[PDB]
Write a protein that binds this DNA or RNA. Sequence first.
RNA 1: CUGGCUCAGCGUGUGCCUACCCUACGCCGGCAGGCGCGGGUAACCCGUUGAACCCCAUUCGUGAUGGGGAUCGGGGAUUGCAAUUAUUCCCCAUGAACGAGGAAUUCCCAGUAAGUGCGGGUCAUAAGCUUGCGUUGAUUAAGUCCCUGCCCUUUGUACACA
Lengths: 144, 141, 100, 115, 75, 191, 55
Amino acid sequence: SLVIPEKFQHILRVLNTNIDGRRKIAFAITAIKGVGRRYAHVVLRKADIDLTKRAGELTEDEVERVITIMQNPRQYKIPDWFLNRQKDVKDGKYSQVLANGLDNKLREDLERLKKIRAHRGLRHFWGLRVRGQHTKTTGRRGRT
Amino acid sequence: GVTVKDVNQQEFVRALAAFLKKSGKLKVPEWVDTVKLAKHKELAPYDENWFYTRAASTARHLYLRGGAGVGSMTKIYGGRQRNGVMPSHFSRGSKSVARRVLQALEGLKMVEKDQDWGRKLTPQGQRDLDRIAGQVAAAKK
Amino acid sequence: HRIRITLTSRNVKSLEKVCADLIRGAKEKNLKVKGPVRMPTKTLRITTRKTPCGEGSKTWDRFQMRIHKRLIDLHSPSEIVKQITSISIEPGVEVEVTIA
Amino acid sequence: FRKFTYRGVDLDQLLDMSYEQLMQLYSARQRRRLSRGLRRKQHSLLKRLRKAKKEAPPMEKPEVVKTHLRDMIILPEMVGSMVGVYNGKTFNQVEIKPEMIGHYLGEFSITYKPV
Amino acid sequence: RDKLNNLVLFDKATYDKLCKEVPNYKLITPAVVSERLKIRGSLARAALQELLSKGLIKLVSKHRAQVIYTRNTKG
Amino acid sequence: TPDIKLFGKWSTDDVQINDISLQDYIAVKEKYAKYLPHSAGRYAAKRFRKAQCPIVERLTNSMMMHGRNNGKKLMTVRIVKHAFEIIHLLTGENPLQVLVNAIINSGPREDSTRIGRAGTVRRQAVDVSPLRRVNQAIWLLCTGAREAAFRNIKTIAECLADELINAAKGSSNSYAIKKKDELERVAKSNR
Amino acid sequence: GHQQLYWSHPRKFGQGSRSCRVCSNRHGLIRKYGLNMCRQCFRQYAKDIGFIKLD
RNA sequence: CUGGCUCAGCGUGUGCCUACCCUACGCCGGCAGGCGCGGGUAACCCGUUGAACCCCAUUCGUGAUGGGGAUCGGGGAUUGCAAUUAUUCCCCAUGAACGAGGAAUUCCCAGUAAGUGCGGGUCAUAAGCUUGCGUUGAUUAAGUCCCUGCCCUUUGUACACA
């Protein structure tokens, strides 16, 4: 039971993510940009997985079923409030975004505010703090 | 014989939460496997059957100090909201969790919507509380 | 018959003068009297800066105002102790009488 | 390059609108903003803005409407228009493309300078 | 500089080292065994609970911070 | 027990301080032998009242430092209890005698200080009093446990148990004995 | 309209709503126990109000 | 980190003009709130102020890591006439320098330092501030003029706006 079983996966590759097999599953699947601690814990509670295992002890069938629940939010009764992307201003679909998708969403969004030339975009472009934060004595490491 | 106050309360609540789970018919809500217990807490409870523990916790809290409504349950189930970079502050519990636990114990013959507000512990409740107290003390014997 | 007189004052020994006066009154007029119940004192506390301007060393005043309260209960009709309560009114002490 | 869409609803659908649906469509700050009541007290100003907009000429780029107001949420009924937003100093002559919906009219100005 | 690459799960020869070396240690704690065998404290504790339950190590007194064991008495 | 008072589970009787200099300023036997370190206080009021405070209570008091561990005498006493279990197991004989011996062997007896002819200055070596021997011995073994435990799996109760076993034997391994011999070196360097 | 413009900006709160009951300026007021006094006017008049320095 | 267990003291509370109070209890909601009917101008009601630290047990295992929470996207609530230059609050997301800090330098000796939370002021919205209150509770010292200041006595002076 406690011995490293046959075919224990030291390295996993899923959604272009390096998940280490030695990590505990709830903090293992948390590695990718879009999946945090809370979203990792709710979806591993959804998939009928014992969260007491390491991320290498599971089987590829248990990997795909936790990957499907991940990309299928409302399809397994995860409510509107939990999602990291709710009512997109182009799509209008309430569903979570993951690594490369969210990189596209954020980049398009701040470049959209830049191109409509709303101040948020103008503060983004001129390279200052966006949320009315005092810059008279803060933000010097990033700006020499 | 012995009563509820004559045994270690650390073993009592686990015994009573198990006792309620041996019944296993506690009108448990839908969103149990997605919810965070307070907006001062960060993660969902480590354990999966946190509802039966809290039901038994509320139950013995009404036993010891009765006439307690949902607002005193949010007070008693409070902790630090460590505000990140700003200093920590006392914060309350989730009103929904406390209310639904009492409504579960109301539907079951243990508590009663009490005059002067809040919930009492009814004679069947007190009986089941006092008998398991004897079972836990006789077990620790 | 349960008349209640609440004596309230900023001065203690002026309050105790009026309090010790009304008990002497109730006893010499042959009346059942609950002795003066010393309710807790309230400390009206205001702490100011001392300077009108800004550029003095940081010093604070600490103004206090203590307010004291006794209440004496009586089992008697209204008009007897009305004649007593009308006697010995000081400038300092403040009296409020309720009937039931 | 493809004709854009608002939340998940075509601009023609948003332009054929009764207020309490668009109240539901856009974000919560704009929801309470318009749920807060009528516009014949302080926003007699914004019914002047409405009157100024719906008094447009024949098919040309309509006359710039100057405003001493910044806090205006751009609904679909005032889009494709020209406006002078008062910055204290400058009346910012800005044009309203239909990506201004649920944004403040006053969020289209800069006062200062970088070094 | 240095990095401490402890195991997450048991090797067959490390399990041999545990079950044979640990019942002669006069002080057995999750800290001591993790240092000597190179294992994570979670597995180190899990093995100590497995070994006590199977009936080899002698527990002294545990705590939420510190769980202390020792060797079984021979004579 | 109107007989004799164990320290949780440790025997106070037949524990002798062999050194005569740290006999007067070490309070463990017969009268100062109590169940707990955690008592009221009222040693800090006067000068030499510190001397009579149970040496195990002195160890507890000194063990907690660096802000985060301030006014946590309940956490500190539970670490000392757990360490006392571990020094009993690792060694075999009485944990009180382990602590006493470690404190006697960790105490310096000559150390340097800047002296008069105040015209300029001079670094001359002087003797430390039996109370200062206790004070520096307990401080140096407490910072020995702290500095050893900081970022290493070896838990603090086990770290103290190492430092106490080492110093009690007169190791040269213990942080307390290294620092002592460093002070007595600098004393020899300027005497 | 002058009765539309003149004193038209609403003041039901802020330090614009309240003034020192003596000197009528809006900086460093005492509102405890319905004083409504600037700290300088209060600290001047304190011992007629019945406040003492004891502590 | 998640559970469970168990202990306070100071206060303030419906406004003069003043609009604006503290809130139990119950149903809806994940949360912020929302909708109901009450108490209190007060040792009367919030309230026995079920506070934090701490204490008992799980998870983690020396990894910039379940340490850190800056910066950032989106959505959700509340106050106000109005929050764009994000007021405040909530949720998912994002996971930065930081491995205990050079020259130098501040405060302090007993319920004191420090940790830890709680009220008052500001206040429509409202604490990283200040001003008070408990809670847990030490190391070192009973000395000196070495450094820094200040005050004396003797002394010299052609200075007295010194």
